[PDB]
């Protein structure tokens, strides 16, 4: 099971590929578009890219409930470590 730092780094790299916000900006204690300004449709973009190139599913039902990068990384953890 991947730990905090590598998953945060992967998300930061995908943000680079998406917008370009510097990787050290992303941190599991900060917030999302009310802080770091990536839209809900661009959450859909993040989710589809991370499903493709990282092989982890993200449902649309749980996408709206993710309002921090900490929330999405926690979702990644309790979707990955369950076999």
């Amino acid at each position: 099971a991947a730990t905090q730092e590598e998953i945060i780094a992967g998300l930061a790299e995908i943000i680079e590929e998406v917008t370009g916000i510097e990787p050290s900006e992303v941190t599991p204690e900060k917030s999302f578009v009310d802080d770091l300004d990536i839209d809900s449709l661009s959450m859909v973009e993040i989710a589809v890219q991370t499903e493709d190139k990282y092989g982890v599913k993200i449902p649309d039902e749980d996408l709206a409930g993710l309002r921090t990068v900490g929330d999405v990384v926690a979702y990644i953890q309790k979707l990955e470590e369950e076999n």
Partner: protein
């Protein structure tokens, strides 16, 4: 991109290949006149030589020993006061002058001069008179056009009496007038297309140097196409039509600027990523040159599918467009790539002046990919709702409304309609050829019988024959009437010189050149068939010619050839897409999306033209619009699909979304430019050309806004693994481990 191959050769030989292309431009524009001049002087006929109407009229001329060509012009004498003896003198002078010029005038039917048929030519109110002149050359040909001009000059030369004017109209005059209108409007349409392209390129690139270089690319490519086609037409290698000239100019300029936008957008995207000039140019070539080859192949083949039709307009639209577009695409791929190469070294000419817009297109691609089914259903409905225009769509053949009303033929028709019915100035020639002599009493009883039968046909207003010199005069002709000099003159004017064929002038009730005329031609033929049936003269031929039979042949050929050419264009464009992408499913998706976009384009164009413009859609507009849409929309879909295939390496969904982000601005700019260049035909005096251009422009706006943007990527994301059959492509790749933090 690997620095080698054709791209390397174009890179090193950029300046020599620019010089070679410039030399080709100079040669093609210095040894052959311009496209407009050669198109005017090498215009193709209106109807095929094998058409029943053309052979019928040629048989008319051969049997009657009057003319040898299928071209008729009416000469209408409209006077404020009733046409008196001064009008008769003026008309006789016109007839004498026409007979004095046998080079362009083959025969003149002196109906008004002879008193026996004089009242036949005059209008019911006795204010206007008309005379038929059979000129030289098949209708629509350059010979027929110059014959019409000579007839007009002859008419204008004679001093008309006060209060009386003469106009030259008719089918051949209508074709000459359409050529004149196109020559009038070509300058303004070219200026409008230049202005639109300049405006769009200023909006997109925002760089003066970039737009000047792109304009040089486009102008030199268009000059190459025009010079090649003018060289072919001048040396009689291929036929040509004014439709072909106008549509070729606009398609050449629009496709050349689309290829320019494709190459410049790819180069600028590569530069924005971070690749230097060499690597950026090589990447642009390796990712867009094959796309441009494919686009040119699709356009050339789609137009070439019209070459296998029957009518000479589509025949002269097929090969010239194919050659012109092939020249445009070769000019793009060679000289535009060379220009990009040489300008890359020169400072920062082609460096993008602003950050390329990808965030919006990337979000749109996310919306497409995540929910492909709703997007696909929405765009399918939005493109099918256009098909609601079928119950009510009309395909009027009335070329009078499609030409300016100030033209000589339109003014002649306007003068005719003020005193005659719409049909009496577009009559029909009929006869029966007896194997024996036709100057017999029983033969004239049979002639009167067939005249009465054809008059009794619904929708036929006026019939003219030896027994009926006018619209309407137990019957019996005594033998002593044979020696009447007036009757002998009527015989010579109505019977064949050997006395074996009798000609009939048929005037319809409604429009002779509307579908009513087509359903009238077969009725006339069959009715004459049973009228001659059961008679001692039975066994004759029923050659019926004129404008109505001509348009009957043209409309049946148009339906069959449009269907077969659409099917051929579908198959050929699918073959080209399969050749490029090596994916049968992707090619099928491209073709299907373009077909549904065609449905939407038909709906929108029919709506606008037939409902708010008020002018019914011309028949060839459908064929040319279908061909150009299958070309250009499939080209845009091919570019998108090729970008998707390049981006697949990171995954299917992410590949589609990255491809959309990278090419959305490029493809939407190119599609907007092409659509606006096609709508630049809206100012063409040929309202048929305006209809073609508006239809194609609206169709391509639909293609780029919703079809290419939504339908194609939605289908691609919905299919996924099977979108690239038989190429074995995986789903989202193997899950990469989460990277070690930096």
């Amino acid at each position: 991109a690997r620095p080698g191959g054709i791209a390397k050769w174009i890179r090193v030989l950029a300046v020599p290949i620019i010089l070679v292309w410039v030399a080709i431009i100079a040669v093609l524009n210095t040894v052959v006149p311009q496209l407009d001049v050669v198109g005017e002087m090498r215009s193709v006929s209106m109807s095929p030589d094998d058409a029943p109407s053309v052979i019928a009229m040629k048989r008319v001329g051969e049997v009657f020993e009057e003319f040898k060509s299928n071209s008729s012009v009416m000469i209408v004498l409209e006077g404020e006061q009733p046409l008196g003896d001064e009008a008769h003198k003026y008309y006789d002078e016109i007839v004498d002058k026409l007979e004095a010029d046998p080079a362009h005038v083959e025969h003149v039917q002196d109906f008004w001069g002879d008193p026996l048929t004089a009242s036949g030519a005059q209008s019911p109110d006795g204010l206007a008179s008309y005379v038929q002149v059979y000129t030289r050359g098949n209708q629509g040909e350059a010979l027929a056009n110059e014959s019409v001009e000579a007839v007009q000059d002859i008419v204008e030369s004679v001093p008309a009496p006060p209060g009386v004017k003469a106009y030259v109209t008719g089918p051949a005059a209508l074709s000459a007038d359409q050529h004149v209108a196109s020559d009038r409007s070509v300058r303004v349409i070219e200026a409008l297309t230049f202005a639109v392209i300049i405006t769009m390129l200023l909006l997109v690139y925002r760089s003066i140097v970039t737009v000047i270089l792109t304009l040089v690319m486009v102008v030199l490519s268009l000059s190459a196409a025009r010079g090649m086609i003018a060289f072919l037409g001048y040396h009689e290698i291929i036929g040509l039509s004014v439709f072909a000239t106008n549509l070729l100019t606009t398609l050449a300029i629009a496709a050349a600027t689309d290829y320019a936008i494709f190459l410049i957008g790819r180069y600028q995207e590569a530069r924005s990523v971070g690749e230097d000039r060499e690597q950026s140019y090589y990447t642009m070539f390796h990712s867009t040159a094959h796309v441009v080859l494919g686009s040119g192949m699709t356009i050339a083949g789609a137009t070439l599918c019209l070459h296998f039709t029957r009518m000479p307009y589509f025949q002269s639209l097929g090969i010239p467009l194919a050659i012109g577009m092939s020249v445009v695409v070769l000019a793009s791929l060679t000289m535009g790539a060379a220009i990009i190469s040489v300008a890359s070294r020169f400072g920062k000419t082609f460096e993008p002046k602003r950050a390329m817009r990808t965030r919006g297109w990337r979000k749109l691609g996310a919306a497409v990919v995540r929910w492909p089914a709703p997007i696909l259903v929405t765009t399918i409905a939005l493109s099918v709702v256009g098909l609601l225009a079928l119950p009510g769509y009309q395909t009027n053949y009335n070329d009078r409304r499609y030409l300016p009303q100030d033209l000589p033929a339109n003014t002649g028709y306007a003068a005719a309609d003020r005193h005659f019915s719409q049909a009496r100035m577009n009559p029909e020639l009929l006869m029966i050829e007896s194997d024996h002599d036709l100057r017999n009493s029983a033969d004239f009883l049979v002639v009167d019988r067939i005249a009465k039968r054809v008059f009794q046909v619904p929708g036929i207003s006026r019939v003219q024959a030896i027994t009926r010199p006018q619209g309407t005069p137990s019957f019996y002709l005594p033998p002593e009437t044979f020696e009447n000099p007036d009757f002998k003159r009527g015989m010579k004017m109505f019977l064949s010189p050997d006395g074996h064929a009798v000609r009939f002038i048929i005037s319809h009730e409604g429009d002779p050149m509307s579908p009513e005329g087509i359903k009238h031609i077969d009725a006339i033929k069959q009715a004459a068939k049973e009228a001659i049936k059961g008679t001692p003269l039975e066994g004759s031929k029923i050659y019926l010619g004129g404008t109505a039979a001509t348009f009957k042949d043209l409309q049946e050929g148009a339906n069959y050839d449009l269907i077969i050419a659409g099917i051929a264009a579908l198959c050929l464009i699918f073959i080209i897409m399969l050749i490029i992408t090596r994916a049968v499913v992707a090619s099928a998706v491209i073709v299907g999306t373009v077909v549904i976009s065609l449905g939407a384009s038909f709906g929108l164009s029919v709506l606008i033209w037939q409902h708010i413009i008020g002018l019914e859609l011309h028949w060839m507009v459908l064929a040319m619009a279908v061909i150009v849409l299958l070309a250009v929309g499939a080209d845009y879909n091919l570019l998108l699909v090729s970008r998707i295939k390049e981006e697949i390496h990171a995954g299917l969904n992410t590949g589609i979304i990255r491809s959309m982000g990278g090419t959305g601005s490029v493809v939407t700019s190119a599609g907007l430019v092409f659509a606006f260049t096609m709508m630049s035909m809206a100012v063409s005096e040929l309202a048929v050309i305006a209809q073609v251009g508006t239809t194609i422009g609206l169709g391509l706006l639909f293609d780029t806004l919703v079809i290419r943007s939504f339908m194609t990527p939605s289908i691609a994301a919905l299919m996924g693994k099977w979108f690239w059959w038989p190429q074995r492509v995986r789903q989202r790749p193997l899950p990469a481990p989460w990277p070690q933090p930096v």
